[PDB]
Design a protein around this ligand. Structure first.
Ligand SMILES: *[C@@H]1O[C@H](CO)[C@@H](O)[C@H](O)[C@H]1NC(C)=O
Ligand SMILES: *[C@@H]1O[C@H](CO)[C@@H](O)[C@H](O)[C@H]1NC(C)=O
Ligand SMILES: *[C@@H]1O[C@H](CO)[C@@H](O)[C@H](O)[C@H]1NC(C)=O
Ligand SMILES: *[C@@H]1O[C@H](CO)[C@@H](O)[C@H](O)[C@H]1NC(C)=O
Lengths: 95, 108, 80, 108, 95, 80
């Protein structure tokens, strides 16, 4: 199984909790992940969404949530581990 | 339970091979994540009594002669993926997209 | 109940009806220009808020412009 | 919604054709009813953007070049049949047998 | 929709009603039928089973339940209509 | 967990494991005698009380004898 940090900056209009935990329901073979998404403009971090993330090989064997895209509009990271998406950074690859 | 294959295999029969679908290679920048995902595909020959998908497959393959064409190597199990993207109203959407990943391959 | 042009529906007066949307696309090859038009059922618009099939795409030596709409006979090709 | 075909059609594309599975032609006398039923089958060419079964189909067909092989004409909807028969314990059984009739055909 | 006569000569061990009606649940396109099955040895009719029957082209456009097999071990007939399986006969084809 | 002979499983020592049953068949053609052996998963034994795949069949110029069993390595061909 898997547990992740949950956050929805749009919680009101979707009628959902703003923050908390999410118990990830998974199938027999499929692996489970956690993800975090945020905006970053003029040094101000704006959270977008956090929660469970289905089987995705981009998140395989990643214990920490690190975004890899060079200057995107909406940053994203995913990881494998319980609550691994609580902290996140932006450390892109060399090239 | 089908058979998995790679470029290091010599299987002429219906097998599941790996494939990465690249959303960025389409020019789709409205998809925040994932930029690419493993979707796989089915390929190989469907010889007799091999990985029959339905009871219908077994019955017609037994009854129908060789004429004129055998079963087709086709997925027998799919799985969804998560996707974070902007929709046509430019809203941030967290969705569960079904029928995106081939898990197994069989003969139909 | 929504009618669309179907370029290959040679037995139904080149017209289909769906609960989905009308589809039309122009694909420019290095040496060819082709067009396709059809109906896309509702359960095939994945995801419904931005379907893959309705999104224009491009690759090496190929550009596929698409147009999805919900008015009757709206999937029409045109010219400058 | 796929396309239905008969011997009076000229459709080279993926189409559903009729077929009767004859249980008696197998020598199966343990099946009281039905002796034969309409099971149909899928046949025809899967040209581009024709009756794509999954979103996975559309994505790989768009991405994957012609190399090396296109989709396979395969069922997209099945239905069960009822069957009255003797089982291995020689008991009269009324059963609902799934995956026996092809209802539609698509490209995967 | 469709209603048929229901009967199960094995009702005890299957823990079901012996007789009565059965409301046939059908899908959008598929047609619905009723069927009857019985044994016939030395002029004594022994009921076997009766109830709904899924889409089967052998039962298409048959308002009366008539078995067609020449001297089977377990007779069978199916029909299209509400309670059409209440009465049944054995009138085989010419050949 | 039930092991059976698999004539075509050339990468798993010609042995498969299933929750179903072991399968083996001999098909006599006018000019040929072939045998196949494999495992049949539980969800593929349709109907479970008398599966089609485990039932012997015959047609014009072909006779397929089959044998289904649940003991370890029970799907063996033999001779008079
Ligand atoms: C809020 O959190 C609880 C605790 O897990 C969960 O059961 C519930 O589905 C969430 N959403 C709402 C609207 O209560
Ligand atoms: C935020 O964006 C700036 C560039 O404007 C970058 O240097 C910094 O590392 C980013 N920090 C995070 C946590 O995304
Ligand atoms: C008996 O008949 C009733 C009336 O339709 C039905 O609801 C029920 O499922 C049947 N079987 C049993 C065991 O009660
Ligand atoms: C019962 O079987 C006899 C033959 O033994 C046949 O002549 C008769 O028509 C049958 N009647 C019914 C109702 O099956």
């Amino acid at each position: 199984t898997r547990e992740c940090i949950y956050y929805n900056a749009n919680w009101e209009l979707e009628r959902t909790n703003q923050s908390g935990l999410e118990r990830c329901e998974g199938e027999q073979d499929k692996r489970l992940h956690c993800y975090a998404s945020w905006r970053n403009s003029s040094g101000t971090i704006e959270l977008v969404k956090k929660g469970c993330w289905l089987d995705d090989f981009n998140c395989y064997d990643r214990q920490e949530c690190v975004a890899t895209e060079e200057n995107p509009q909406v940053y994203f990271c995913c990881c494998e581990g319980n609550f691994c998406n609580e902290r996140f950074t932006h450390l892109p690859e060399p090239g | 339970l089908g058979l998995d294959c790679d470029e290091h295999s010599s299987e002429s029969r219906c097998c599941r091979y790996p494939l990465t679908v690249d959303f960025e290679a389409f020019g789709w920048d409205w998809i925040i994540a994932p930029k690419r995902y493993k979707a796989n595909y089915c390929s190989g020959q469907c010889e007799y009594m091999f990985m029959q998908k339905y009871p219908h497959t077994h019955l017609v393959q037994q009854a129908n002669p060789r004429g004129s064409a055998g079963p087709c190597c086709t997925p027998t199990k799919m799985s969804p993926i998560n996707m974070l993207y902007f929709n046509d109203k430019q809203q941030i959407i967290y969705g569960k997209i079904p029928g995106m990943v081939v898990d197994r391959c069989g003969c139909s | 109940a929504l009618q669309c042009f179907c370029h290959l529906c040679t037995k139904d007066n080149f017209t289909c009806v769906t609960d989905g949307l009308c589809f039309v696309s122009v694909t420019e090859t290095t040496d060819k220009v082709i067009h396709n038009s059809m109906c896309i059922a509702e359960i095939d618009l994945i995801p419904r808020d931005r379907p893959f099939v309705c999104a224009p795409s491009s690759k090496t030596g190929s550009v596929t412009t698409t147009y999805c709409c919900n008015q009757d006979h709206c999937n029409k090709i045109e010219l400058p």
